[PDB]
Design a protein around this ligand. Structure first.
Ligand SMILES: NC(=O)c1cc[n+](COC[n+]2ccc(/C=N/O)cc2/C=N/O)cc1
Ligand SMILES: NC(=O)c1cc[n+](COC[n+]2ccc(/C=N/O)cc2/C=N/O)cc1
Lengths: 535, 533
């Protein structure tokens, strides 16, 4: 204070922050990285809801990203950029309840709609500091205020002994909520408009967006929601209390540990230890299942997300939801024998039948067989390309595409304004093999405008496309309508309705309007497969 | 005394009639007895060979139609009456007809034996659509069609009983086949090129002869139009037969002997009267008295027999029409009538599915419903109505044909498949029914060649192709024109390629996968579903 840049000093409820002038392609952005928003959920506060960050004295340095929440680091393909980019890029620490604010520089004159990013990562990983989450471009180019919060992933954030006091579960969501509160209270200090807060996120982040939609206390904290390749409903995003309990207790067992005693013990265990074992607690060989995820606690989540979407009403809600061309593929290389990033993963019907059990771990044989039955191309039932692609499709449809359909469906049905997309563009920079197509999580860098960074080798059409997506997103943030209110030479993105089921393709090509998110196959997943469990 | 019209078969002498076919004359020997009238004590009994007769049996007129339900749902309406008996009903109806070229062909000629449909409860070999004159004249075929007992008379089985062993309508047919073997040379027929062909139940029977050992020496090729021995309707288990028999017997006021005797006492029409009360569910495309897995004629389930059989010295021509199921929707599926577009509501669809797949558990019905629902257009009646048509067609004919065509090929039979896509210009059912069950027969039999029938000339030409495929198939085991390169070729249906041709007014187009996905559902998952629940 005195010699430094007047435009980078902001006070927030917790006290004084000094941010950083960051270079974006189009010019400078204000950045306030690693702002604490909670008391470090450390020591005795492990598993506990976050507590509001106690005000600090002097100026907090908000110039660099803070610690990433303690998490499993993926090491299946070490060195590989396609997994590296998701890996923590800051120190792993339980003290990681920090959030990031990008805004134009200078900060916007008039209150500016807020985008709050919630990262995915299966609820066991992710960090708002990942390069693909860099909000400088949306800040710079769209003049948006962008906020991303770390929240506790894995056990630290989602280990629950439901009903207990010391590990009530969902605290990762509560961290998220707490940041959302933080934005309400503090965002105006940055020229953010607390009255125009959009949540967007992807994979688990989307599920988290969704759960905020579905959780009353969160509802007053944002106005519009974007769920990219994630939904709070679906087989992966939550667990029953019983399952949470069973997993928490087994994880306990596995590290050597009445809920207090158990949790107390868990709290004496080193972070790493918990991480080291978080994945041993899954009931089956699974892909796209994660150990510690939001629990249906009958608190944060009053009931199952399934119920909550089926029955709640979503009047004041505008929701942009969508999927990528290939939700499944990514998950295939991490547990489905046959699959790899290093070959074309042409599998056998055996390997498929197998992968279906892994992909749909919750399936009884009959269910699994229905899956196989549905996805087999009965012309080419032995066809490795088809089976590989089917396997992709199964995992993607089951965990992402169909829940998204269900979600957009029920949401529209219940008077929410829903825009739907399928993002069909494969980053020209993608390092995954062509077979994986546009895999889970690979629209994010476009939404964020990474292509705008010339030093990132994206093609010029990827820059144009990036701005387009950024337009959509920020338009949607701004108005609850991704559409450019002026510009109408460009085709409209109709709301997804139950009657029309319209959604747009997001390619390099202009918006193509399609009907039915896998309407047919999703009938299978959303309508039939449930009934096949009931017997 | 035209000696062309004069044949001596084993049983004595026949006087045929010289019939005019559009391109010349044919010898028709109609009303030829091939079994002792299955009357009186003989009712429900296997047919015994007709006793020899004195003098010259007038064989110029069709004989009685086997005693069957006459359909009344739309009286006077050509669309239904065309299937109704066009002769006097009578249990005394074990006669076959032979058309031949006139003159009697010089060299032994491939015989096609037609087995009519009629759900095993009706049909007759005298109906115009089974007129063998065209195939005799145009294609030089010796064409035989028998009557075989239908309904209770042909198929009321008290399995294991002496006096209603079951499958006697099939035995009737087997007898006609023996009769052809024993007699057809006398007509110029080649008892070494006998091709059975038939539709609906006529196909199931054709298939049942494929599946029945005694029948195998009685034909070489088989053509199964729009029906199969496998599948939901063509057979019943012994227990279900017994059940329906005993039930029918209850309904007409009656150990097996003591019961059959009583059924024996009953005027035909009394049996026919109650023939329908005996279906376990409010069904469609389900018939009360059908061949029974008796462990005898059918040593095991057609599925068992088609899964496990060896079929490598067998050629089969199988196919379906575009709308197998539609026809059946008007006969018990609320909301369907030939007298509107039958645009149904979602509810009527879920309902018209427990009637179409009557044996479905709610789960299986739901399975069917979710499968057939166009989720882009979930409530659009045009779809629901077509899906209904589809459900019933696929369930009953298409997919059964699929499994059959698949199993036969797998197990070494040479198989040709088709989907018949041409709707007759003269069709009397409304358009929404498309190409209903049964409506390729007119074409195969070459009826469009009779100019007085007001078939378009493009249909005349089509009929001719079909007759040519069928008779080529009859001649050679291969429907393809054995000299004629300007194609395309009808490839054998194989389990790999699953190729089959559309028969329509365009040239053959080869499609692959006979509703592969949908039949997957029907032939793979549905069994598993009910096979648990
Ligand atoms: N802690 C866990 O539950 C866990 C940890 C690691 N994996 C495997 O990491 C592979 N991987 C890598 C990236 C993603 C994407 N997440 O949004 C998902 C996955 C999981 N597939 O089953 C699964 C579960
Ligand atoms: N005896 C019976 O089981 C019976 C009698 C009459 N019908 C009604 O006739 C309508 N109909 C008319 C023609 C056909 C075609 N058969 O190949 C089939 C059907 C049956 N649909 O459920 C059905 C069963």
């Amino acid at each position: 204070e005195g010699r430094e840049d007047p435009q980078l000093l902001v006070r927030v409820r917790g006290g004084q922050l000094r941010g950083i002038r960051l270079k974006a392609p189009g010019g400078p952005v204000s950045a306030f990285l690693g702002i604490p928003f909670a008391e470090p959920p450390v020591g005795s506060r492990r598993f506990m809801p976050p507590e509001p960050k106690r005000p600090w004295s002097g100026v907090l340095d908000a110039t660099t990203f803070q610690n990433v929440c303690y998490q499993y680091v993926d090491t299946l393909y070490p060195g590989f950029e396609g997994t590296e980019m998701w890996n923590p890029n800051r120190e792993l620490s339980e003290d990681c309840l920090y959030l990031n604010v990008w805004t134009p520089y200078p900060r916007p004159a008039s209150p500016t709609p807020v985008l709050i990013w919630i990262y995915g990562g299966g609820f066991y990983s992710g960090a708002a500091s990942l390069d693909v989450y860099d909000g400088r471009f949306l800040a710079q180019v769209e003049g948006a205020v962008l906020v991303s919060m770390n929240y506790r992933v894995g056990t630290f954030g989602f280990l629950a002994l439901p009903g207990s006091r010391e590990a009530p579960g969902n605290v990762g969501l509560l961290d998220q909520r707490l940041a959302l509160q933080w934005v309400q209270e503090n965002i105006a200090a940055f020229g953010g408009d607390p009255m125009s807060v959009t949540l967007f996120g992807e994979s688990a982040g989307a599920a988290s967006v969704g759960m905020h939609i579905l959780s009353l206390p969160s509802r007053s904290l944002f106005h519009r929601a974007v769920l990219q390749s994630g939904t709070p409903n679906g087989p992966w995003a939550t667990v029953s209390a019983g399952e949470a309990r069973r997993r928490a207790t087994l994880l306990a067992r596995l590290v050597g540990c009445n809920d207090t005693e158990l949790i107390a013990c868990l709290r004496t265990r080193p972070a790493q230890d918990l991480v080291d074992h978080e994945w041993h607690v899954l009931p089956q060989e699974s892909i796209f299942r994660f150990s510690f995820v939001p629990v249906v606690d009958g608190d944060f989540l009053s009931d199952t997300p399934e119920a909550l979407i089926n029955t709640g009403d979503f009047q004041d809600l505008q929701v942009l939801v969508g999927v990528v061309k290939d939700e499944g593929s990514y998950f295939l290389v991490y547990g489905v024998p046959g699959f790899s990033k290093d070959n074309e993963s042409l599998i056998s019907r055996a390997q498929f039948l197998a992968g279906v059990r892994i992909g749909v771990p919750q399936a009884s044989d009959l269910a699994a067989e229905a899956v196989v039955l549905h996805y087999t191309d009965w012309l080419h039932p032995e066809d490795p390309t088809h089976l590989r692609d089917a396997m992709s499709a199964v995992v993607g449809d089951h965990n992402v595409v169909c829940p998204v359909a269900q979600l957009a469906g029920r949401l529209a049905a219940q008077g929410a304004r829903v825009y739907a997309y399928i993002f069909e563009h494969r980053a020209s920079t993608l390092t995954w093999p062509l077979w994986m197509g546009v895999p889970h999580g690979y629209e994010i860098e476009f939404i964020f405008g990474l292509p705008l960074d010339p030093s990132l080798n994206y093609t010029t059409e990827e820059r144009i496309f990036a701005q387009r997506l950024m337009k959509y997103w920020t338009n949607f943030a701004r108005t609850g309508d991704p559409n450019d209110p002026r510009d109408s030479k460009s085709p409209q993105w109709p709301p997804y309705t139950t009657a029309a089921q319209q959604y747009v393709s997001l390619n390099l090509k202009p918006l193509e309007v399609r009907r039915g998110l896998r309407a047919q196959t999703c009938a299978f997943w959303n309508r039939f497969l449930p009934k096949l469990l009931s017997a």
